[PDB]
Amino acid sequence: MVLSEGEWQLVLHVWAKVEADVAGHGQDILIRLFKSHPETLEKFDRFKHLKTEAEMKASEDLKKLGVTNLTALGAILKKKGHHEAELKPLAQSHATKHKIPIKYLEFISEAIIHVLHSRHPGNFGADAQGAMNKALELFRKDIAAKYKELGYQG
Ligand code: HEM
């Protein structure tokens, strides 16, 4: 799979809006992930204790984590597919240290799409969402291949 420049444009156009407030989008996305797929929260030893959305929103550390997560993703998206260098450290830590299965990357991809659909309807119409889904599917495909190379693929 490979995206067209036109599709990359749709992806980077909405991401530019996301960047107006990375911290806020990071919070919304992680909170959506944890509420839609509670099992995912268990992978965060530093935040596994959070019981409610209120506690999640009030967590300064969770906010920092969200910023780090979206900034890393933004760098990857901006490479428009030429993200081999960026995927190496990310794949290693998530496969070997955090033990994050591909299914969970699909879950966070779903959360990203949900939040963008909610916050940016004008710039996240059907075609734009399709482009973003295509970009995230490419990300997960390449990450999965790396996982396999690293001996995890899960
Ligand atoms: C869009 C996909 C994701 C990106 C770009 C991403 C990015 C990052 C980055 C940059 C870090 C810090 C450096 C590192 O350890 O590699 C990190 C840490 C971490 N990630 Fe992810 N991540 C993603 C998805 C996930 C998912 C789905 C989970 C689990 C449900 C997860 C769990 C973790 C954990 C447990 C840490 C450690 C947090 C801490 O205690 O400091 N990540 N991630």
GROMACS .gro file of N, CA and C and ligand atoms in nm:
model
  505
    1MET      N    1   0.085  -0.123   0.000
    1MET     CA    2   0.000   0.000   0.000
    1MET      C    3   0.087   0.125   0.000
    2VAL      N    4   0.041   0.227  -0.072
    2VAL     CA    5   0.113   0.354  -0.082
    2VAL      C    6   0.013   0.467  -0.102
    3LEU      N    7   0.030   0.576  -0.029
    3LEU     CA    8  -0.060   0.689  -0.042
    3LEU      C    9  -0.019   0.784  -0.153
    4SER      N   10  -0.117   0.855  -0.207
    4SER     CA   11  -0.089   0.952  -0.311
    4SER      C   12  -0.056   1.082  -0.239
    5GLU      N   13   0.004   1.177  -0.310
    5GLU     CA   14   0.038   1.307  -0.250
    5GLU      C   15  -0.091   1.375  -0.206
    6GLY      N   16  -0.196   1.358  -0.285
    6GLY     CA   17  -0.324   1.417  -0.253
    6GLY      C   18  -0.375   1.366  -0.119
    7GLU      N   19  -0.360   1.237  -0.095
    7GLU     CA   20  -0.404   1.178   0.031
    7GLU      C   21  -0.316   1.228   0.146
    8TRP      N   22  -0.186   1.242   0.122
    8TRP     CA   23  -0.097   1.293   0.226
    8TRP      C   24  -0.138   1.436   0.261
    9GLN      N   25  -0.179   1.513   0.161
    9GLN     CA   26  -0.221   1.651   0.184
    9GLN      C   27  -0.341   1.657   0.278
   10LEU      N   28  -0.435   1.565   0.261
   10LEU     CA   29  -0.554   1.561   0.346
   10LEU      C   30  -0.514   1.525   0.488
   11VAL      N   31  -0.416   1.437   0.502
   11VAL     CA   32  -0.367   1.394   0.632
   11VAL      C   33  -0.294   1.507   0.705
   12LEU      N   34  -0.203   1.574   0.635
   12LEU     CA   35  -0.126   1.681   0.696
   12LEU      C   36  -0.208   1.808   0.719
   13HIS      N   37  -0.316   1.824   0.644
   13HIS     CA   38  -0.402   1.941   0.659
   13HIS      C   39  -0.475   1.935   0.793
   14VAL      N   40  -0.529   1.818   0.827
   14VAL     CA   41  -0.599   1.806   0.954
   14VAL      C   42  -0.499   1.798   1.069
   15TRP      N   43  -0.381   1.741   1.043
   15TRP     CA   44  -0.282   1.734   1.150
   15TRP      C   45  -0.235   1.874   1.188
   16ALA      N   46  -0.236   1.965   1.092
   16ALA     CA   47  -0.195   2.102   1.118
   16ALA      C   48  -0.291   2.165   1.219
   17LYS      N   49  -0.417   2.123   1.214
   17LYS     CA   50  -0.517   2.175   1.308
   17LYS      C   51  -0.492   2.110   1.443
   18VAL      N   52  -0.459   1.981   1.442
   18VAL     CA   53  -0.430   1.909   1.564
   18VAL      C   54  -0.314   1.978   1.636
   19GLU      N   55  -0.216   2.024   1.560
   19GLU     CA   56  -0.099   2.088   1.620
   19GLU      C   57  -0.126   2.223   1.684
   20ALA      N   58  -0.245   2.277   1.666
   20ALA     CA   59  -0.278   2.405   1.729
   20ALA      C   60  -0.283   2.382   1.880
   21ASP      N   61  -0.312   2.258   1.919
   21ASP     CA   62  -0.321   2.222   2.061
   21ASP      C   63  -0.290   2.073   2.079
   22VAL      N   64  -0.163   2.038   2.066
   22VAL     CA   65  -0.125   1.898   2.078
   22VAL      C   66  -0.164   1.836   2.212
   23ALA      N   67  -0.139   1.909   2.320
   23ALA     CA   68  -0.172   1.857   2.453
   23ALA      C   69  -0.320   1.820   2.466
   24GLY      N   70  -0.408   1.909   2.421
   24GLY     CA   71  -0.550   1.883   2.429
   24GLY      C   72  -0.593   1.762   2.348
   25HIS      N   73  -0.542   1.751   2.225
   25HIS     CA   74  -0.576   1.638   2.141
   25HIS      C   75  -0.520   1.510   2.202
   26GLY      N   76  -0.402   1.521   2.263
   26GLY     CA   77  -0.341   1.404   2.324
   26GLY      C   78  -0.426   1.351   2.437
   27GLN      N   79  -0.479   1.442   2.519
   27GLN     CA   80  -0.564   1.401   2.630
   27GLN      C   81  -0.690   1.332   2.579
   28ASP      N   82  -0.759   1.396   2.486
   28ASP     CA   83  -0.882   1.341   2.430
   28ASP      C   84  -0.861   1.201   2.372
   29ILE      N   85  -0.753   1.185   2.296
   29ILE     CA   86  -0.724   1.057   2.233
   29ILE      C   87  -0.693   0.945   2.333
   30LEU      N   88  -0.608   0.971   2.431
   30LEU     CA   89  -0.576   0.869   2.530
   30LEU      C   90  -0.700   0.836   2.614
   31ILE      N   91  -0.775   0.938   2.653
   31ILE     CA   92  -0.895   0.916   2.733
   31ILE      C   93  -0.997   0.833   2.655
   32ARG      N   94  -1.009   0.859   2.525
   32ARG     CA   95  -1.102   0.785   2.441
   32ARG      C   96  -1.055   0.640   2.432
   33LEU      N   97  -0.924   0.621   2.418
   33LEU     CA   98  -0.867   0.488   2.411
   33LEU      C   99  -0.900   0.409   2.538
   34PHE      N  100  -0.870   0.467   2.653
   34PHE     CA  101  -0.894   0.401   2.781
   34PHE      C  102  -1.040   0.373   2.812
   35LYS      N  103  -1.130   0.458   2.762
   35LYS     CA  104  -1.272   0.436   2.787
   35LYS      C  105  -1.331   0.334   2.691
   36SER      N  106  -1.284   0.335   2.566
   36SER     CA  107  -1.334   0.242   2.465
   36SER      C  108  -1.272   0.103   2.478
   37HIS      N  109  -1.148   0.098   2.525
   37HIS     CA  110  -1.077  -0.028   2.541
   37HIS      C  111  -0.997  -0.024   2.671
   38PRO      N  112  -1.067  -0.036   2.785
   38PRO     CA  113  -1.009  -0.034   2.920
   38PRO      C  114  -0.884  -0.120   2.938
   39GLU      N  115  -0.878  -0.233   2.870
   39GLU     CA  116  -0.762  -0.322   2.882
   39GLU      C  117  -0.632  -0.253   2.845
   40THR      N  118  -0.639  -0.155   2.755
   40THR     CA  119  -0.520  -0.084   2.712
   40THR      C  120  -0.454  -0.004   2.825
   41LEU      N  121  -0.535   0.045   2.919
   41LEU     CA  122  -0.481   0.123   3.030
   41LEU      C  123  -0.385   0.040   3.116
   42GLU      N  124  -0.409  -0.091   3.119
   42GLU     CA  125  -0.327  -0.182   3.198
   42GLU      C  126  -0.181  -0.187   3.155
   43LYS      N  127  -0.153  -0.142   3.033
   43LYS     CA  128  -0.016  -0.143   2.983
   43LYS      C  129   0.066  -0.025   3.034
   44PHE      N  130  -0.001   0.074   3.093
   44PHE     CA  131   0.068   0.190   3.145
   44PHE      C  132   0.085   0.177   3.296
   45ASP      N  133   0.201   0.127   3.338
   45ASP     CA  134   0.228   0.109   3.480
   45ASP      C  135   0.220   0.240   3.558
   46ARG      N  136   0.248   0.351   3.491
   46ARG     CA  137   0.245   0.481   3.556
   46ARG      C  138   0.105   0.542   3.568
   47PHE      N  139   0.009   0.490   3.492
   47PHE     CA  140  -0.126   0.546   3.492
   47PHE      C  141  -0.239   0.446   3.515
   48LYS      N  142  -0.203   0.319   3.526
   48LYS     CA  143  -0.298   0.210   3.546
   48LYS      C  144  -0.397   0.234   3.661
   49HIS      N  145  -0.359   0.318   3.756
   49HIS     CA  146  -0.442   0.345   3.873
   49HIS      C  147  -0.559   0.441   3.849
   50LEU      N  148  -0.550   0.524   3.745
   50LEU     CA  149  -0.656   0.621   3.715
   50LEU      C  150  -0.790   0.550   3.702
   51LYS      N  151  -0.889   0.598   3.776
   51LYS     CA  152  -1.022   0.537   3.778
   51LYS      C  153  -1.127   0.605   3.692
   52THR      N  154  -1.117   0.737   3.677
   52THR     CA  155  -1.217   0.812   3.602
   52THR      C  156  -1.159   0.905   3.497
   53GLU      N  157  -1.245   0.954   3.408
   53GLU     CA  158  -1.203   1.046   3.304
   53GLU      C  159  -1.157   1.175   3.371
   54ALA      N  160  -1.220   1.208   3.483
   54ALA     CA  161  -1.184   1.328   3.557
   54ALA      C  162  -1.039   1.319   3.606
   55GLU      N  163  -1.001   1.204   3.658
   55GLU     CA  164  -0.865   1.186   3.707
   55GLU      C  165  -0.767   1.186   3.591
   56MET      N  166  -0.810   1.132   3.477
   56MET     CA  167  -0.725   1.129   3.358
   56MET      C  168  -0.699   1.271   3.307
   57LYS      N  169  -0.804   1.352   3.304
   57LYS     CA  170  -0.791   1.490   3.257
   57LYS      C  171  -0.704   1.574   3.349
   58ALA      N  172  -0.710   1.544   3.478
   58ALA     CA  173  -0.633   1.618   3.577
   58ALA      C  174  -0.488   1.572   3.589
   59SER      N  175  -0.455   1.461   3.523
   59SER     CA  176  -0.320   1.407   3.529
   59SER      C  177  -0.221   1.480   3.441
   60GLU      N  178  -0.128   1.553   3.502
   60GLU     CA  179  -0.028   1.627   3.427
   60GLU      C  180   0.064   1.530   3.353
   61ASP      N  181   0.096   1.418   3.417
   61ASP     CA  182   0.183   1.319   3.356
   61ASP      C  183   0.118   1.253   3.235
   62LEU      N  184  -0.013   1.229   3.242
   62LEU     CA  185  -0.082   1.168   3.129
   62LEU      C  186  -0.084   1.267   3.013
   63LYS      N  187  -0.098   1.396   3.045
   63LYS     CA  188  -0.098   1.498   2.941
   63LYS      C  189   0.037   1.500   2.870
   64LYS      N  190   0.145   1.489   2.948
   64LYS     CA  191   0.280   1.489   2.891
   64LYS      C  192   0.296   1.368   2.799
   65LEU      N  193   0.243   1.255   2.843
   65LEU     CA  194   0.251   1.132   2.765
   65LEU      C  195   0.177   1.148   2.633
   66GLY      N  196   0.063   1.216   2.637
   66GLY     CA  197  -0.015   1.238   2.517
   66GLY      C  198   0.059   1.324   2.418
   67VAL      N  199   0.127   1.427   2.468
   67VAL     CA  200   0.204   1.516   2.381
   67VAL      C  201   0.317   1.437   2.314
   68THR      N  202   0.385   1.355   2.392
   68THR     CA  203   0.495   1.274   2.341
   68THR      C  204   0.446   1.177   2.235
   69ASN      N  205   0.330   1.117   2.260
   69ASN     CA  206   0.269   1.022   2.167
   69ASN      C  207   0.233   1.088   2.033
   70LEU      N  208   0.160   1.199   2.038
   70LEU     CA  209   0.120   1.266   1.915
   70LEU      C  210   0.233   1.334   1.840
   71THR      N  211   0.336   1.377   1.912
   71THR     CA  212   0.450   1.442   1.847
   71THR      C  213   0.527   1.337   1.768
   72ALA      N  214   0.540   1.217   1.825
   72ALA     CA  215   0.609   1.109   1.757
   72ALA      C  216   0.529   1.068   1.633
   73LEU      N  217   0.397   1.063   1.647
   73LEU     CA  218   0.312   1.026   1.534
   73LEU      C  219   0.316   1.133   1.425
   74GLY      N  220   0.318   1.259   1.466
   74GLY     CA  221   0.324   1.368   1.370
   74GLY      C  222   0.450   1.361   1.287
   75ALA      N  223   0.562   1.331   1.352
   75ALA     CA  224   0.690   1.322   1.281
   75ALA      C  225   0.682   1.212   1.175
   76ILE      N  226   0.618   1.101   1.210
   76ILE     CA  227   0.603   0.989   1.119
   76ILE      C  228   0.515   1.028   1.001
   77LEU      N  229   0.399   1.088   1.029
   77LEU     CA  230   0.308   1.129   0.923
   77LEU      C  231   0.373   1.227   0.826
   78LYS      N  232   0.453   1.319   0.880
   78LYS     CA  233   0.520   1.419   0.797
   78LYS      C  234   0.624   1.359   0.702
   79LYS      N  235   0.669   1.237   0.731
   79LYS     CA  236   0.766   1.170   0.643
   79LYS      C  237   0.695   1.111   0.522
   80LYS      N  238   0.562   1.115   0.524
   80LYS     CA  239   0.481   1.066   0.414
   80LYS      C  240   0.521   0.927   0.364
   81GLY      N  241   0.540   0.835   0.457
   81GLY     CA  242   0.575   0.699   0.419
   81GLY      C  243   0.722   0.664   0.432
   82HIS      N  244   0.809   0.764   0.429
   82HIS     CA  245   0.953   0.741   0.440
   82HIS      C  246   0.990   0.752   0.587
   83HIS      N  247   0.927   0.668   0.668
   83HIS     CA  248   0.945   0.670   0.813
   83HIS      C  249   1.024   0.554   0.872
   84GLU      N  250   1.107   0.490   0.791
   84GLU     CA  251   1.185   0.377   0.843
   84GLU      C  252   1.270   0.412   0.964
   85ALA      N  253   1.336   0.528   0.962
   85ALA     CA  254   1.420   0.567   1.074
   85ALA      C  255   1.339   0.590   1.201
   86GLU      N  256   1.227   0.660   1.187
   86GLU     CA  257   1.140   0.690   1.299
   86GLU      C  258   1.076   0.565   1.361
   87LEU      N  259   1.046   0.466   1.277
   87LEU     CA  260   0.982   0.345   1.326
   87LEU      C  261   1.072   0.253   1.408
   88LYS      N  262   1.203   0.262   1.388
   88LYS     CA  263   1.295   0.174   1.461
   88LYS      C  264   1.288   0.184   1.613
   89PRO      N  265   1.314   0.302   1.671
   89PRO     CA  266   1.308   0.312   1.817
   89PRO      C  267   1.167   0.291   1.874
   90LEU      N  268   1.067   0.335   1.800
   90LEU     CA  269   0.927   0.321   1.841
   90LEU      C  270   0.887   0.174   1.845
   91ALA      N  271   0.920   0.102   1.738
   91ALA     CA  272   0.889  -0.040   1.731
   91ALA      C  273   0.963  -0.117   1.839
   92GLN      N  274   1.090  -0.084   1.861
   92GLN     CA  275   1.164  -0.156   1.963
   92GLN      C  276   1.107  -0.139   2.103
   93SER      N  277   1.082  -0.015   2.143
   93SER     CA  278   1.029   0.009   2.277
   93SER      C  279   0.891  -0.052   2.297
   94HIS      N  280   0.803  -0.034   2.199
   94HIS     CA  281   0.668  -0.088   2.212
   94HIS      C  282   0.655  -0.239   2.198
   95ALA      N  283   0.750  -0.301   2.130
   95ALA     CA  284   0.745  -0.446   2.115
   95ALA      C  285   0.812  -0.515   2.233
   96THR      N  286   0.930  -0.465   2.270
   96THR     CA  287   1.011  -0.524   2.376
   96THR      C  288   0.997  -0.472   2.518
   97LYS      N  289   0.973  -0.342   2.533
   97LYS     CA  290   0.960  -0.283   2.665
   97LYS      C  291   0.814  -0.277   2.711
   98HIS      N  292   0.731  -0.212   2.630
   98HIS     CA  293   0.589  -0.195   2.663
   98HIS      C  294   0.498  -0.314   2.628
   99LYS      N  295   0.540  -0.395   2.531
   99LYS     CA  296   0.462  -0.511   2.488
   99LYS      C  297   0.323  -0.470   2.442
  100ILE      N  298   0.318  -0.384   2.340
  100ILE     CA  299   0.193  -0.336   2.286
  100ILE      C  300   0.155  -0.411   2.158
  101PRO      N  301   0.051  -0.495   2.165
  101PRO     CA  302   0.009  -0.571   2.047
  101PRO      C  303  -0.049  -0.484   1.935
  102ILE      N  304  -0.040  -0.532   1.812
  102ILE     CA  305  -0.091  -0.458   1.697
  102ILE      C  306  -0.238  -0.422   1.718
  103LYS      N  307  -0.312  -0.512   1.780
  103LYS     CA  308  -0.453  -0.488   1.807
  103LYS      C  309  -0.471  -0.358   1.885
  104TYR      N  310  -0.378  -0.329   1.976
  104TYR     CA  311  -0.385  -0.206   2.055
  104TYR      C  312  -0.350  -0.084   1.971
  105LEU      N  313  -0.267  -0.102   1.869
  105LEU     CA  314  -0.232   0.010   1.782
  105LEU      C  315  -0.355   0.038   1.696
  106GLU      N  316  -0.434  -0.065   1.670
  106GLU     CA  317  -0.556  -0.045   1.592
  106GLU      C  318  -0.652   0.033   1.680
  107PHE      N  319  -0.657  -0.003   1.808
  107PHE     CA  320  -0.744   0.067   1.902
  107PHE      C  321  -0.712   0.216   1.912
  108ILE      N  322  -0.584   0.250   1.922
  108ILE     CA  323  -0.549   0.391   1.933
  108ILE      C  324  -0.574   0.461   1.800
  109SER      N  325  -0.563   0.387   1.690
  109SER     CA  326  -0.588   0.444   1.558
  109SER      C  327  -0.736   0.482   1.552
  110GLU      N  328  -0.820   0.397   1.609
  110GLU     CA  329  -0.963   0.421   1.613
  110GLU      C  330  -0.993   0.545   1.696
  111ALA      N  331  -0.920   0.561   1.807
  111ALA     CA  332  -0.937   0.675   1.896
  111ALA      C  333  -0.895   0.805   1.828
  112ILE      N  334  -0.788   0.799   1.750
  112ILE     CA  335  -0.740   0.917   1.678
  112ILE      C  336  -0.846   0.961   1.579
  113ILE      N  337  -0.901   0.865   1.506
  113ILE     CA  338  -1.003   0.895   1.407
  113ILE      C  339  -1.128   0.953   1.474
  114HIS      N  340  -1.166   0.896   1.588
  114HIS     CA  341  -1.284   0.944   1.659
  114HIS      C  342  -1.268   1.090   1.702
  115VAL      N  343  -1.154   1.122   1.763
  115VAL     CA  344  -1.129   1.257   1.811
  115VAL      C  345  -1.119   1.358   1.697
  116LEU      N  346  -1.052   1.322   1.588
  116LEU     CA  347  -1.041   1.414   1.475
  116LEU      C  348  -1.179   1.437   1.413
  117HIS      N  349  -1.260   1.332   1.405
  117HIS     CA  350  -1.394   1.342   1.349
  117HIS      C  351  -1.478   1.437   1.434
  118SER      N  352  -1.459   1.429   1.565
  118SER     CA  353  -1.532   1.514   1.658
  118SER      C  354  -1.488   1.659   1.659
  119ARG      N  355  -1.357   1.681   1.666
  119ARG     CA  356  -1.304   1.817   1.673
  119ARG      C  357  -1.287   1.893   1.542
  120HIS      N  358  -1.272   1.820   1.431
  120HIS     CA  359  -1.246   1.882   1.301
  120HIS      C  360  -1.335   1.834   1.187
  121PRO      N  361  -1.468   1.838   1.204
  121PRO     CA  362  -1.561   1.793   1.100
  121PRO      C  363  -1.538   1.853   0.962
  122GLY      N  364  -1.508   1.982   0.957
  122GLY     CA  365  -1.485   2.049   0.830
  122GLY      C  366  -1.363   1.999   0.756
  123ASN      N  367  -1.257   1.966   0.831
  123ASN     CA  368  -1.133   1.917   0.772
  123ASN      C  369  -1.113   1.767   0.786
  124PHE      N  370  -1.218   1.699   0.831
  124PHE     CA  371  -1.211   1.555   0.846
  124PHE      C  372  -1.339   1.495   0.791
  125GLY      N  373  -1.368   1.528   0.665
  125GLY     CA  374  -1.485   1.474   0.599
  125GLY      C  375  -1.450   1.331   0.560
  126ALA      N  376  -1.535   1.268   0.479
  126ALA     CA  377  -1.514   1.130   0.437
  126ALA      C  378  -1.380   1.106   0.368
  127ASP      N  379  -1.347   1.186   0.268
  127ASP     CA  380  -1.220   1.166   0.198
  127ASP      C  381  -1.100   1.185   0.291
  128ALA      N  382  -1.105   1.287   0.376
  128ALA     CA  383  -0.995   1.313   0.469
  128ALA      C  384  -0.979   1.197   0.568
  129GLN      N  385  -1.091   1.146   0.618
  129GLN     CA  386  -1.084   1.034   0.713
  129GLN      C  387  -1.025   0.911   0.644
  130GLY      N  388  -1.064   0.891   0.518
  130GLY     CA  389  -1.013   0.777   0.444
  130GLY      C  390  -0.862   0.788   0.428
  131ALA      N  391  -0.814   0.910   0.404
  131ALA     CA  392  -0.671   0.933   0.387
  131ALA      C  393  -0.598   0.904   0.518
  132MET      N  394  -0.653   0.953   0.628
  132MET     CA  395  -0.592   0.931   0.759
  132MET      C  396  -0.592   0.783   0.793
  133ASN      N  397  -0.701   0.714   0.762
  133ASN     CA  398  -0.707   0.571   0.790
  133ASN      C  399  -0.600   0.500   0.709
  134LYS      N  400  -0.583   0.543   0.585
  134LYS     CA  401  -0.484   0.481   0.498
  134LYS      C  402  -0.344   0.504   0.555
  135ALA      N  403  -0.319   0.624   0.607
  135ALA     CA  404  -0.190   0.657   0.665
  135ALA      C  405  -0.163   0.575   0.791
  136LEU      N  406  -0.266   0.557   0.874
  136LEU     CA  407  -0.249   0.480   0.996
  136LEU      C  408  -0.237   0.331   0.966
  137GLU      N  409  -0.301   0.285   0.859
  137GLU     CA  410  -0.292   0.144   0.823
  137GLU      C  411  -0.150   0.115   0.774
  138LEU      N  412  -0.090   0.213   0.706
  138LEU     CA  413   0.047   0.198   0.656
  138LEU      C  414   0.141   0.193   0.775
  139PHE      N  415   0.117   0.281   0.871
  139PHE     CA  416   0.196   0.287   0.994
  139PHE      C  417   0.190   0.152   1.066
  140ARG      N  418   0.069   0.100   1.086
  140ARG     CA  419   0.053  -0.028   1.155
  140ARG      C  420   0.112  -0.144   1.076
  141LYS      N  421   0.105  -0.136   0.943
  141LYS     CA  422   0.160  -0.244   0.861
  141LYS      C  423   0.312  -0.248   0.876
  142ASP      N  424   0.375  -0.132   0.862
  142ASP     CA  425   0.520  -0.125   0.873
  142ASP      C  426   0.566  -0.155   1.016
  143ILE      N  427   0.489  -0.108   1.115
  143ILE     CA  428   0.523  -0.136   1.254
  143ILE      C  429   0.514  -0.286   1.279
  144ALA      N  430   0.411  -0.349   1.223
  144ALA     CA  431   0.393  -0.493   1.241
  144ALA      C  432   0.511  -0.569   1.181
  145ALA      N  433   0.558  -0.525   1.065
  145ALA     CA  434   0.671  -0.590   0.999
  145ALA      C  435   0.796  -0.579   1.086
  146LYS      N  436   0.813  -0.463   1.148
  146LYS     CA  437   0.928  -0.439   1.236
  146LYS      C  438   0.917  -0.527   1.359
  147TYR      N  439   0.796  -0.535   1.414
  147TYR     CA  440   0.770  -0.619   1.531
  147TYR      C  441   0.820  -0.761   1.502
  148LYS      N  442   0.780  -0.812   1.386
  148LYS     CA  443   0.818  -0.947   1.344
  148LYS      C  444   0.970  -0.961   1.338
  149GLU      N  445   1.036  -0.860   1.283
  149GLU     CA  446   1.182  -0.861   1.272
  149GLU      C  447   1.246  -0.862   1.411
  150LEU      N  448   1.182  -0.793   1.505
  150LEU     CA  449   1.230  -0.783   1.643
  150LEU      C  450   1.197  -0.907   1.725
  151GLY      N  451   1.113  -0.995   1.671
  151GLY     CA  452   1.077  -1.119   1.739
  151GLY      C  453   0.952  -1.114   1.824
  152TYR      N  454   0.868  -1.014   1.802
  152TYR     CA  455   0.746  -0.998   1.880
  152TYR      C  456   0.618  -1.022   1.800
  153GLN      N  457   0.589  -0.934   1.705
  153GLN     CA  458   0.470  -0.945   1.622
  153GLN      C  459   0.351  -0.998   1.703
  154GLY      N  460   0.287  -0.909   1.778
  154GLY     CA  461   0.173  -0.949   1.859
  154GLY      C  462   0.070  -0.838   1.873
  155HEM     C1  463   0.027   0.609   1.748
  155HEM     C2  464   0.098   0.506   1.820
  155HEM     C3  465   0.184   0.534   1.926
  155HEM     C4  466   0.289   0.621   1.927
  155HEM     C5  467   0.333   0.713   1.814
  155HEM     C6  468   0.351   0.608   2.057
  155HEM     C7  469   0.459   0.683   2.098
  155HEM     C8  470   0.520   0.673   2.221
  155HEM     C9  471   0.637   0.748   2.259
  155HEM    C10  472   0.711   0.850   2.174
  155HEM    C11  473   0.670   0.708   2.383
  155HEM    C12  474   0.795   0.748   2.461
  155HEM    C13  475   0.922   0.686   2.405
  155HEM    C14  476   0.913   0.534   2.393
  155HEM     O1  477   0.903   0.466   2.497
  155HEM     O2  478   0.914   0.484   2.278
  155HEM    C15  479   0.571   0.609   2.423
  155HEM    C16  480   0.569   0.545   2.546
  155HEM    C17  481   0.477   0.448   2.583
  155HEM     N1  482   0.378   0.399   2.501
  155HEM    FE1  483   0.333   0.455   2.318
  155HEM     N2  484   0.287   0.514   2.136
  155HEM    C18  485   0.184   0.469   2.056
  155HEM    C19  486   0.088   0.378   2.095
  155HEM    C20  487   0.084   0.316   2.218
  155HEM    C21  488  -0.021   0.226   2.260
  155HEM    C22  489  -0.145   0.189   2.180
  155HEM    C23  490   0.010   0.187   2.386
  155HEM    C24  491  -0.059   0.095   2.467
  155HEM    C25  492  -0.203   0.080   2.468
  155HEM    C26  493   0.134   0.253   2.420
  155HEM    C27  494   0.197   0.240   2.542
  155HEM    C28  495   0.311   0.308   2.580
  155HEM    C29  496   0.368   0.300   2.712
  155HEM    C30  497   0.325   0.207   2.824
  155HEM    C31  498   0.469   0.389   2.715
  155HEM    C32  499   0.545   0.433   2.839
  155HEM    C33  500   0.481   0.555   2.904
  155HEM    C34  501   0.553   0.600   3.029
  155HEM     O3  502   0.525   0.543   3.137
  155HEM     O4  503   0.638   0.690   3.020
  155HEM     N3  504   0.179   0.334   2.318
  155HEM     N4  505   0.479   0.587   2.322
   0.00000   0.00000   0.00000
